[PDB]
């Protein structure tokens, strides 16, 4: 996250860190039930040197605050039994950039570990709404990755504006969230984490999955996120949640 601040400890108890063994923190995820996380499909694509698609390569940390303190009280360590990437995921366009991760053992709910709420398929996150992005990604483009979880407040951008800012790149699964002026944005290593939206009684719903951007925090280049409501039924079908 560029332009953000240190989160308070336990502030985002649905934010999860995914480490690939020997590679450190690679992406974020969100806790949605005792057994399931939502993340970004593009995080789990093999390259010639590492099989990111193999669930056995991964560790999820729940209740994590500081990457240098992974054994701190209340942090829960879990393996993955399965990665379900969206069948329509495209590694060139990043369309359908969403995956479901099955924990090998259930999370224990606590003050530090709590699921985010899922929005119904009919819910619209309106243009202009303030939303929060969180993660341990870079704090400057080409920069480096934060030890302490970062938070930044960003706003939903109108889809037509989004399409025009990033021509031939924005599908209806995608949403721009940020500022046309730049300044606050997700960045490398934030991929897969949740957008957190404060809803009508203060409960927090997931409004998206961190996906991609052109640089970070640049003018006219807000971050791109996978939308959540359109995947509500897909989530239910595949997880029971």
Ligand X SMILES: *SC[C@H](NC(=O)CC[C@H](N)C(=O)O)C(=O)NCC(=O)O
Tell me the C-alpha to C-alpha distance, in Å, between residue 184 and each of 49, 89, 119, 174, 189.
33, 27, 24, 18, 15
Min CB(13)–ligand X separation in Å: 7
The CB-of-179 to ligand X minimum distance in angstroms stands at: 24
- The answer to whether residue 109 forms part of the interface with ligand X (CB under 6 A) is yes
Question: Could you say whether residue 114 binds ligand X (CB under 6 A)?
Answer: yes
**Closer by beta carbon to ligand X, 31 or else 217:** 31
DSSP-assigned letters across all residues of 198-225: E-TTS-EEEEEEEEE-SSSS-TT--EEE
Q: Tally the C-alpha atoms within 13 A of residue 66's C-alpha that lie toward its C-beta.
A: 7
Residues in the interface with ligand X (CB under 6 A) total 7
Nearer to ligand X, 46 or 108 (CB): 108
| Binding to ligand X in span 200-239, by CB under 6 A | 203-204
What six digits make up the tokens of 32? 């949605």
Question: Which CB, 64 or 116, lies closer to ligand X?
Answer: 116
Identified binder of ligand X from the candidate list 117, 143, 219, 236, rule CB under 6 A: 117
Nearer to ligand X, 105 or 203 (CB): 203
CA 103 to CA 19: how far, in whole Å? Answer: 14
Which residue, 102 or 199, has its beta carbon nearer to ligand X?
Answer: 199
Which residue of the chain is nearest ligand X when measured via CB? 117
Touching ligand X, residues 167-206 (CB under 6 A): 203-204
The smaller minimum CB distance to ligand X, of residues 88 and 109, is found at: 109
Which of 21-29, 75-83, 108-116, 206-214 is the region at the interface with ligand X (rule: CB under 6 A)? 108-116
User: What is the nearest approach in angstroms of ligand X to the Cβ of residue 202?
Assistant: 7
Distance from C-alpha of 27 to C-alpha of 40, rounded to nearest angstrom: 8
| DSSP secondary structure code for residue 98 in this structure | -
Per CB under 6 A, the segment of 64-72, 93-101, 112-120, 136-144 that binds ligand X is 112-120
- What's the CA gap between 103 and 80, in Å, rounded? 5
CB of 113 to ligand X, least distance (A): 9
CB of 109: closest distance to ligand X in angstroms?
5
CA 25 from chain centre, in angstroms, equals 13
DSSP 40: -
Task: Report yes or no: 222 and 184 within 8 Å, Cβ to Cβ.
Answer: no
CA torsion 21-22-23-27 (nearest 10°) is 20
**Rounded Cα gap, residues 51 and 56, in angstroms:** 10
The nearer residue to ligand X, 2 or 235, going by C-beta atoms, is 235
- The residues of the shown chain that bind ligand X, judged by CB under 6 A, are 109, 114-117, 203-204
């Amino acid at each position: 996250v560029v332009g953000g601040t240190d989160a308070d400890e336990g502030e985002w108890p649905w934010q999860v860190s995914l480490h690939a063994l020997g590679q450190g923190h690679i992406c974020g995820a969100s806790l949605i039930s005792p057994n399931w996380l939502v993340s970004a499909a593009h995080c789990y694509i093999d390259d010639r040197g590492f099989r990111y698609s193999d669930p056995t390569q991964w560790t999820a940390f729940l209740g994590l605050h500081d990457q240098s303190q992974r054994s701190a009280p209340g942090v829960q360590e879990r393996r993955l039994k399965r990665i379900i990437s969206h069948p329509f995921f495209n590694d060139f366009t990043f369309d359908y950039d969403i995956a479901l991760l099955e924990l090998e053992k259930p999370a224990e709910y606590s003050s530090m570990v709590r699921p985010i709420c899922l929005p119904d398929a009919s819910h619209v996150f309106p243009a202009g709404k303030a939303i929060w992005v969180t993660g341990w990604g870079h704090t400057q483009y080409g920069g480096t990755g934060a030890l302490i979880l970062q938070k930044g407040e960003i706003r939903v951008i109108q889809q037509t504006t989004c399409e025009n800012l990033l021509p031939q790149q924005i599908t209806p699964r995608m949403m721009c969230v940020g500022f046309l002026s730049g300044g606050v944005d997700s960045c490398q290593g934030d991929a897969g984490g949740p957008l957190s939206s404060v809803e009508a009684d203060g409960r927090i719903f997931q409004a998206g999955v961190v996906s991609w951007g052109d640089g970070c925090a640049q003018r006219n280049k807000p971050g791109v996120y996978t939308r959540l409501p359109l995947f509500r039924d897909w989530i239910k079908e595949n997880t029971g949640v």
